[PDB]
Design a protein around this ligand. Structure first.
Ligand SMILES: Nc1nc2c(ncn2[C@@H]2O[C@H](COP(=O)(O)OP(=O)(O)OP(=O)(O)O)[C@@H](O)[C@H]2O)c(=O)[nH]1
Ligand SMILES: Nc1nc2c(ncn2[C@@H]2O[C@H](COP(=O)(O)OP(=O)(O)O)[C@@H](O)[C@H]2O)c(=O)[nH]1
Ligand SMILES: Nc1ncnc2c1ncn2[C@@H]1O[C@H](COP(=O)(O)OP(=O)(O)O)[C@@H](O)[C@H]1O
Ligand SMILES: Nc1ncnc2c1ncn2[C@@H]1O[C@H](COP(=O)(O)OP(=O)(O)O)[C@@H](O)[C@H]1O
Ligand code: ALF
Ligand SMILES: [Mg+2]
Ligand SMILES: [Mg+2]
Lengths: 428, 355, 428, 334
């Protein structure tokens, strides 16, 4: 039943996936053990797209956990909702790519690839129908980036039909955490845009500020950030996994949001961003929600829409809402943000109301916009690239592992091409 | 009468010279002799206004009401009674230019049963463009050996299918990638290609025979793209000069619509090729600043042929029957649009080895 | 027994058919099981047991809607044989529903419908419910309509689709689906009815006076429309006119076969006391330019046909007087060779509103199937939208990659242009 | 006969269209072979890249590495082995265009002794552009006689030295002014000039011999008058077709430019600026800033075809001016 396969890569990838499966289990009333104990039969019924039933109500999440450092999966085992997985899935190495993409693609990853590929394709054949692949990963480290690239290459070479969907965590413009993360991201996204069809730009400082001010948080732990990502991803597919008055799926988001093959990089968005106790200073309702969802204050990247145009938007409106008000609101935001809006492509909106709301929250929406503002992010990434490239800054680590600058030059050329496409369609 | 014959021969040679030196692509519309089975099934009417203009009136009732005088003037139009020599006569100067040190690409646009393999391969009966081109190339090679030019021929065979590159020469499954050379950004090569050095025309004939046997082993021929790259290097010891040229023999897949008798993925790749080619040629006609050359493998492989320093040929193989009149007229429209196209000026490359 | 059948495809089709069949079971005193605790023999096959199975088949490529109707109150109403279900939606592609996945269930549904036809004694026609801009509502329906015309041709293929709205556009690729299905529907449709969304919104706003209606109300109005359409078959009236006369009565030309619906009274329960419900006043109300179901100005298009359907204790004398008075109006317009186009479907079977619905119990109700040159402007604007989207060949890769070519795109466009030429030449 | 020349008329119209589409303005370079009196002259290292590109290199290794790149591309390159026939092969289409009613400019550019006079006038042993042009023009007129066309040639000889025009066909010194034509504001005419009517090649040969004799050339006799004067030869074509009218008028401007070496350059610099502005599609062209450019109003328009030859001496001492001439040519090719 149009099932979906779930992939893990990097520490960030594994953690965000962990909280994501906790969120989904909350959605469908699933105990940490694996036995169903919710009251809504409807969730349990359609649970096959995620939780493949094994025996007696114990549902194994369709999860593949890939890493080269056993610590992350050790934490998952120790952590709750880790034992719920079928332990055969924890397919990991021992050495570690050491935040080195070449190591993540030709060293230990290059041998763990088959030992994870067997399990993933056995799970795929165990499922009835398949839709795509969600590489829940990060571009921060080299591991979850290099092996992720190799794995998507393999999946594309074996499955041409499916619609993969990587939730890449784009490096922060300012709060840089890795000395050579620009090289890692550039090399990864080269092969991605070579094969992939949907990525995302999530900035750690973006969520840091969002929780600092919008959420009134003082300790932006990675718990908060990866909780937001989980809610976002969950909303991406609640259309498929749940009934609705006007239902959508991954296919809709795949074939509507891409006017062109390459131009397939995305920006998510979610509402409502209520703070801890802000239920009084405003009254919760869908108009104020739609107002506070499209602003640059409630984006996900550092790519300010004040320098880009929303090529397409795919608001989902998970919950119960009125089409009339959202039509009026999109018309009005078209009127006001026309400057930051593709004049060449009109009537760009994808209201796909899905009936079921999230737990304990009456109204919800997931913004998905193809803002022509990522090119600034790619320009800063390529500038970091060339600045580190004039002196080949700490290039010995990559070159020593049988790798040549030809690929770096090509990846930089292709990112310049991506910036050219973004600007060429933003101005035109 | 001898002066009249000399004037006629020189006029024909000058016409060949101007039409080959003509910029961009020498769009040629060839109508093969109609098959008797399809003739009695259904056929339409065609009239040749001249040797380079064709008009498929088809004198229909509804099709005529939609499409009447379909007269398109090209560089050369071939009658159904035209022989193989009639189509190799103007390709001979093309091969001369290729051996001069120019990159050359040859295309054959047509549907199933058009006669594309009759153009290049030539069908088991008679010969095609490929063997006569090889013979002319070797004759010019010996002539330039008498002129002191030592030339080497390098052959690489590639087949493009459903985004997966297949080596026609090697049956082993290999991951093929096409990349620009390190020496120059314009020339683009393919990695891990089965590349051999031609020793004699007999070896080339045997290689062609085994390649075509694999191709037949690989109705896929009706709807598959194969790319032949013949790279030539000519060294002159006395002059210490190297002349480099390439020949690109490319047979496009069937241009027929999906209809009913067609599989999904092959149709999809055919659509990729045709749609991307149409988009890039219309952008070139629109003098667009950027041509999205890196969307499909077909245009990216032939960057020198399409966006570099090369001269390209169009062979418009069209079935003259009415049952395929829509596709025939659409192909004629594409041929007219690409005849209106322009290409970068041809540049001869001379490499002096003084250093 | 003038027995006819209906098919329902796509979310619009299935929900509209659900409404239609709930209303029929209510008007006939039919329980959800399928018995009445003759007239109804035209749509309900009588089993050996005390059960009247509807002569309808719900088919969709996506199991969600058929699944929900199986979970609806009317599973016992439907013989589970008819509920033909696919696996994945048409991804909003005419290409899909007409070339890729259709050729795999069309045989099954054709066998189903031929089984029903051989079950039927005297076959009248077909009632297909679907969308126009929706993928399956265009592809799959064009495939079925041509296939049935091949099968019968002589039967009354009555297409009852949804015309997409000018301003609000839920999907993004509607121009493609519309132009393609019309390219493949014009040459084999007896007559296709047209319904718009903005008009139903305006009607429920200013006439029903409801601020927040769901699709259930839209479908309720559609259901009352079809019930009034078919009451002549289902019941005896003073002047009964059936579907067979409709082909010759409505269209003046073989190809100009796109009438638009209109229901009256359209008032809520409050205005029932404020109105004494005369036949003349509703006769005027159905003709007013803000009461039609299609966003056009009927004052700006010469009428070619106005089939007026009535129900309840209505005498033809006052109806004749009222239509004569409306003929004397200045704003109303007609063509030359049809100066007497007023054919009336007077009937003395009062309509009944569903319990818990919106409309009140009205002794009389009238529906008019207006067919006028006013919808030519709507056709022109949709063709313009398609032409501008196709100008830069945006999105076209999907359709070409599921069995489509631009040549017949332009052929369909010139077919639309010829349709407009026919419209203007009938206008003069 | 009639059909033959009708097809010839269509072919020449299409040839004019082709020439207009190509760009009309074409630059060629010709190198004079060394003579018997210059065998002890230091030459230059001429590396022939193609038939459209050539690079000149100084023998002195001290300056060879201090000049960078000296490569220049043209439309066609003529080596010393090239005969006058090869040069004239690129002029006959322009002669046809003149027959068709278009204005043609033929220019020879270079330093003193480069061969501009040899390129244009030539020698009795090997005739230059002018005699071959005259012979082809008379043969074309004989051909046009078959299609009613009556062509009459009006030749004017004048010389420009210091922005003052002198008549070479008469010793009666007068004051001549260049004024706009009576029936065309764009066309130009000069008063008081002797406009003889040419009847046969012998007549025009006598006219050019008389003009040369009255010119009093001193290019090598003091390097005062001929080496700093412009020899402008103008051939007017008046095509007249009977029973159909629709006459056509063309002009052939054979100009032998003065020396481009450093010391009048007043006319040469203005001609260079005008040519560059034409290549740049400039809205305003400084035509009236020099007598030579003022005379060539109709022959430097959009439909007019301009031809230039860059003659360079293959000698080391002529390197400093050869590089300037090739830089002027590169200002055209790029
Ligand atoms: N009036 C009304 N319209 C509906 C309803 N459901 C869907 N639609 C319309 O259907 C259009 C899209 O076509 P769908 O029926 O939803 O889709 P489909 O025909 O099944 O094919 P897909 O586009 O692949 O899903 C939308 O613009 C909706 O407005 C409904 O319940 N009532
Ligand atoms: N959303 C989210 N991102 C994280 C979290 N922890 C780390 N990150 C980001 O993800 C990247 C992780 O690098 P990673 O690929 O896992 O390192 P590697 O596996 O050793 O190669 C870092 O750059 C962080 O920016 C988290 O808990 N949530
Ligand atoms: N000039 C011609 N003379 C004889 N037969 C021809 C000619 N052109 C095409 N044909 C026939 O058309 C058929 C097409 O076969 P082939 O060329 O392999 O496929 P396609 O035309 O699709 O490339 C051949 O079997 C050949 O007999
Ligand atoms: N190819 C040649 N062979 C022999 N003599 C030549 C050649 N070219 C020029 N001359 C000599 O040069 C003289 C012509 O001078 P020239 O160089 O044409 O003057 P200018 O410098 O004005 O062009 C003639 O007297 C002739 O003897
Ligand atoms: F039939 Al052929 F290619 F078109 F093999
Ligand atoms: Mg073939
Ligand atoms: Mg002299």
């Amino acid at each position: 039943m149009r099932e979906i396969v779930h992939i893990q890569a990097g520490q960030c990838g594994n953690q965000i996936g962990a909280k994501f499966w906790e969120v989904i289990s909350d959605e469908h009333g699933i105990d940490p053990t694996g036995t169903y104990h919710g009251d809504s039969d409807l969730q349990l019924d359609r649970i096959s797209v995620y939780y493949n039933e094994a025996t007696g109500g114990k549902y194994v999440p369709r999860a593949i956990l890939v890493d080269l450092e056993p610590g992350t999966m050790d934490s998952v085992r120790s952590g709750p909702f880790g034992q719920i997985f079928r332990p055969d899935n924890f397919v990991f190495g021992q050495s570690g790519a050491g935040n080195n993409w070449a190591k993540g693609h030709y060293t230990e990853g290059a041998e763990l690839v088959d030992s994870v590929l067997d399990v993933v394709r056995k799970e795929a054949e165990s499922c009835d129908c398949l839709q795509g692949f969600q590489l829940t990963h990060s571009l921060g480290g080299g591991t979850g980036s290099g092996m992720g690239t190799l794995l998507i290459s393999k999946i594309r070479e074996e499955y041409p039909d499916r619609i993969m969907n990587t939730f890449s965590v784009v490096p922060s413009p300012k709060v840089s955490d890795t000395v050579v993360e620009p090289y890692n991201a550039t090399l990864s996204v080269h092969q991605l845009v070579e094969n992939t069809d949907e990525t995302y730009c999530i900035d750690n400082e973006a969520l840091y500020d969002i929780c600092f001010r919008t959420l009134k948080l003082t300790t932006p732990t990675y718990g908060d950030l990866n909780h937001l990502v989980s809610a976002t991803m969950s909303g991406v597919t609640t259309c498929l996994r749940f009934p609705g008055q006007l239902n959508a799926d991954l296919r809709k988001l795949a074939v509507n949001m891409v006017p062109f093959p390459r131009l397939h990089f995305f920006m998510p968005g979610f509402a409502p961003l209520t703070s801890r106790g802000s239920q009084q200073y405003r009254a919760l309702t869908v108009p104020e929600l739609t107002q506070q969802v499209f602003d640059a204050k409630n984006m996900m990247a550092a790519c300010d829409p004040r320098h880009g145009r929303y090529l397409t938007v795919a608001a989902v409106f998970r919950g119960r809402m009125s089409m009339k008000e959202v039509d009026e609101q999109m018309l009005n935001v078209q009127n006001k943000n026309s400057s930051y809006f593709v004049e060449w492509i009109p009537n760009n909106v994808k209201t796909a109301v899905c009936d079921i709301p999230p737990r304990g929250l009456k109204m919800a929406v997931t913004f998905i916009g193809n803002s022509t503002a990522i090119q600034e992010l790619f320009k800063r990434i390529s500038e970091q690239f060339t600045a580190m490239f004039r002196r080949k800054a700490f290039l010995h680590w990559y070159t020593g592992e049988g790798m040549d600058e030809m690929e770096f030059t090509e990846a930089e050329s292709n990112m310049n091409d991506l910036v050219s496409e973004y600007q060429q369609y933003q101005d035109a | 009468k001898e002066q009249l014959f000399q004037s006629n021969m020189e006029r024909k040679e000058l016409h060949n010279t101007v039409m080959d030196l003509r910029g961009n692509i020498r769009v040629f519309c060839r109508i093969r002799p109609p098959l008797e089975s399809e003739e009695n099934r259904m056929c339409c009417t065609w009239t040749y206004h001249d040797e380079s203009t064709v008009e498929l009136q088809s004198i229909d009732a509804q099709a005529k009401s939609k499409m009447g005088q379909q007269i398109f003037s090209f560089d050369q139009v071939f009658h159904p009674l035209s022989s193989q020599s009639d189509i190799f006569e103007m390709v001979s100067p093309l091969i001369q230019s290729a051996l001069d040190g120019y990159n050359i690409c040859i295309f054959a646009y047509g549907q199933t049963g058009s006669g594309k393999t009759y153009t290049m391969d030539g069908v088991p009966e008679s010969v095609g463009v490929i063997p006569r081109t090889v013979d002319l190339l070797f004759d010019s090679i010996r002539g330039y050996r008498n002129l002191g030019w030592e030339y080497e021929i390098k052959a690489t065979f590639l087949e493009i299918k459903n985004e997966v590159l297949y080596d026609l020469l090697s049956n082993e499954q290999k991951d093929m990638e096409i990349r620009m050379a390190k020496n120059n950004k314009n020339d683009i090569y393919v990695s891990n290609i089965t590349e051999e050095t031609v020793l004699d025309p007999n070896h080339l004939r045997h290689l062609m025979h085994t390649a075509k046997m694999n191709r037949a082993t690989a109705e896929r021929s009706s709807r598959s793209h194969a790319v032949t790259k013949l790279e030539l290097i000519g060294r002159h010891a006395e002059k210490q000069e190297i002349s480099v040229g390439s020949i690109n023999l490319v047979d496009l897949a069937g241009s027929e619509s999906p209809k009913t008798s067609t599989r999904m993925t092959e149709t999809k790749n055919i659509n990729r090729s045709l749609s991307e080619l149409t988009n890039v040629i219309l952008a070139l006609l629109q003098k667009q600043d950027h041509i999205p050359y890196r969307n499909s493998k077909l245009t990216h492989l032939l960057m020198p042929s399409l966006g570099g320093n090369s001269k390209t040929l169009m062979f418009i193989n069209v079935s003259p029957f009415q049952d395929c009149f829509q596709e025939s007229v659409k192909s004629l429209r594409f041929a007219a649009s690409v005849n209106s196209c322009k290409m970068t000026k041809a540049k001869r490359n001379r490499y002096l080895n003084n250093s | 027994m003038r027995e006819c059948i209906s098919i329902h495809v796509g979310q619009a089709g299935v929900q509209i058919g659900n409404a239609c069949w709930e209303l029929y079971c209510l008007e006939h005193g039919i329980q959800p099981d399928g018995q009445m605790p003759d007239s109804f023999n035209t749509f309900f096959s009588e089993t050996g047991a005390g059960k009247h199975v509807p002569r309808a088949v719900f088919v969709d490529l996506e199991p969600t809607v058929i699944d929900e109707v199986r979970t609806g109150t009317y599973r016992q109403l439907f013989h589970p044989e008819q509920l033909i279900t696919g696996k994945e939606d048409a991804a909003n592609n005419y290409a899909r529903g007409h070339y890729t996945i259709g050729k795999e269930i069309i045989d099954l549904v054709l066998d189903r419908i031929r089984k029903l036809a051989d079950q039927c004694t005297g076959l009248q026609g077909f009632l297909v419910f679907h969308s126009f801009g929706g993928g399956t509502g265009s592809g799959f329906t064009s495939l079925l309509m041509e296939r049935l015309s091949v099968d019968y041709g002589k039967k009354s293929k009555l297409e009852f689709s949804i015309y997409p709205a000018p301003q609000v556009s839920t999907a993004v690729v509607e121009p493609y689906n519309s132009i393609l299905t019309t390219h493949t529907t014009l040459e084999h449709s007896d007559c296709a009815f047209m319904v718009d969304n903005e008009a139903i919104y305006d009607i429920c706003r200013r006439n029903l006076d409801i601020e927040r209606p769901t699709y259930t109300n839209l479908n309720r109005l559609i259901s009352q429309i079809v019930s009034s359409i078919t009451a002549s078959l289902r019941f005896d009236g003073a002047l009964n006119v059936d579907l067979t006369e409709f082909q010759t009565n409505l269209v003046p030309y073989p190809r100009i076969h796109f009438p638009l619906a209109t229901y009256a009274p359209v008032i809520s329960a409050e205005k029932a006391y404020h109105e004494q419900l005369s036949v003349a006043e509703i006769t005027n109300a159905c003709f007013e330019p803000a009461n039609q179901m299609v966003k056009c100005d009927p004052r700006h298009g010469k009428y070619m046909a106005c089939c007026l359907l009535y129900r309840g204790d209505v005498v033809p004398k006052d109806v004749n007087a009222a239509i004569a008075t409306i003929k004397t109006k200045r704003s109303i317009q007609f063509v030359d060779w049809c100066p007497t186009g007023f054919k009336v479907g007077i009937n003395y079977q009062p309509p009944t509103v569903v319990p818990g619905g919106d409309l009140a119990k009205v002794q009389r109700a009238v529906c008019m199937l207006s067919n006028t040159t006013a919808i030519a402007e709507a056709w022109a604007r949709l063709d313009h939208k398609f032409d501008l989207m196709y100008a830069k060949r945006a999105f076209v890769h999907w359709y070409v990659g599921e069995g489509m070519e631009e040549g017949e795109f332009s052929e369909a466009r010139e077919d639309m242009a010829a349709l407009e030429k026919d419209y203007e030449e009938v206008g003069v």
